[PDB]
Write a structure and sequence with these properties.
homodimer, 310 residues, alpha+beta, eight-stranded mixed beta sheet, 13 strands, globular, binds chloride ion, protease (chain B), Taspase1 (chain B)
Amino acid sequence: GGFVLVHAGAGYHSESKAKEYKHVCKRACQKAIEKLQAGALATDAVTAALVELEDSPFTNAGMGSNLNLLGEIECDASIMDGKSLNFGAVGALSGIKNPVSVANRLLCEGQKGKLGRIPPCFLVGEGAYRWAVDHGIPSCPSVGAVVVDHEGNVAAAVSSGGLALKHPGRVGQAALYGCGCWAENTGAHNPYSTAVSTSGCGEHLVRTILARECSHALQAEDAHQALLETMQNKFISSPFLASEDGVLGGVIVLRSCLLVEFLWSHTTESMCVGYMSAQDGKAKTHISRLPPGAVAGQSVAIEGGVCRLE
Amino acid sequence: GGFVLVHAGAGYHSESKAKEYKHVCKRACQKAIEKLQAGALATDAVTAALVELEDSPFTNAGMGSNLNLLGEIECDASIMDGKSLNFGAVGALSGIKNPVSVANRLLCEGQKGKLSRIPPCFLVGEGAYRWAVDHGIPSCSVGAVVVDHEGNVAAAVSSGGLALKHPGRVGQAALYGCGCWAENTGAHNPYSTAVSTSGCGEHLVRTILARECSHALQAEDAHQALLETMQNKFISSPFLASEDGVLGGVIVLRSCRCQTLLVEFLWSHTTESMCVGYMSAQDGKAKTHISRLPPGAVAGQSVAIEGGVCRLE
Ligand SMILES: [Cl-]
Ligand SMILES: [Cl-]
């Protein structure tokens, strides 16, 4: 029981790398489902999806991340569990094969409470790396996902290698809380359990805290129209980005109340996505492209559909 | 002209060591009015203040900051311009006397333009140092909110982070919308608002408190808004429902034109105390205070809040 929606390559359309993203999206979804069926939690699932997404030599995450000004590699990643509302994130991490794994570890450790001080929800540089190792994590000698288990718990994660030639020590939206992803269950204030993951120009997603912002909007009755409004009002026309010459970014979203509504939206020419139900078998991949004539970073594309989980 | 409100951290009340805080708060405010009247950006006013704070060996920021799990100093700090809406942050930065300066610098370079490439607003550790260095920045929580005569606002925050924290651990002082916030009145927000936080970093980050306070202050009665936020969106916030005791403090200011500039400024905290300091332009006098939780009121369970009103121009 469960559902998964992932993304990769939310940027500019290439009549080439298309077939790859589809392939990595196909398995990323499956690994996730494998876990959901096998019984794992929303977080273990999403993590596995991102482990697969990062491992694709074609994604700018984990192995294959772009290189900073000094040719060195630095990864950003974060994850959030909707049931407990905990968050794990790493920034400018190097030497680890799966940065998301370190964020997930930080999250899990963080759920053990002060078992003997308040746990760290975000580490960076050498520190993140040392903590990772100090916890038995594979040391090497933008992609994201959303999930909902049989119980109804949503979760999300995101992983990226950052901008190319970015100055050393530059952290983007995949490490920043409320920006890269957001996972939050139902509550006396939230009618729906929502999960979000972002991609694109990290600076545009941060200045606007898009993830959190999408989750709050998606509390409205019309999911499709809530997201649309967010991508336009709070993103494309956001006062906080008025000094920009184009607003680039994309997001995937999941909303379960067990009814599951899933959507994706971008202001980039394209974004590849894949999804699959656990009571569905065989994944589904799609390349989302902006309407003809619509200018990249000036308009919005958005699609999605419902999916009942029995 | 202009106004200023600062703080030297929210936490335990230290009698005797209490006079050291009120003292640095004063010098901090002054440096602000000074640079302010000199006709400098609201950005320089807050930095000017933060530096003064960062230099007091009694404040967990800059010089005298808590040592990490390895006996070393790693600082976080950020700054936000309410006019341009830019932001500058550094996290886990060692080797620089004034982190806020690097935060400020990063902001400016941003305002300038596009290297093509979008400027970087958030840098951590190693590169954060190298950068601060290639920008002539002297090598070796506190907050401040300001409003210039034109009605613009700016917020800054600087912290040494949790004591004995595991290396590379970043807190609120470095995270957008968490440690500080600044936003001029706009088509939507009627009020120019500025916020700076302090306290248990994890608690402030998960509640994105700084930005939350700016949204809340958009309601009619600021005092009521600020209080309900500290209670319902902080102490009783669903995201901290597991934390037994929420510790944090915030100082904020709200302006608007009526020709005068009506300014409401407050300070609130769930910690035992918080030393703040406010002073107006032609005020010529700096007032300090050590906010304290109501006698017999549990810390991390209760909320203390105060605030006055200032009129400029
Ligand atoms: Cl990618
Ligand atoms: Cl602090």
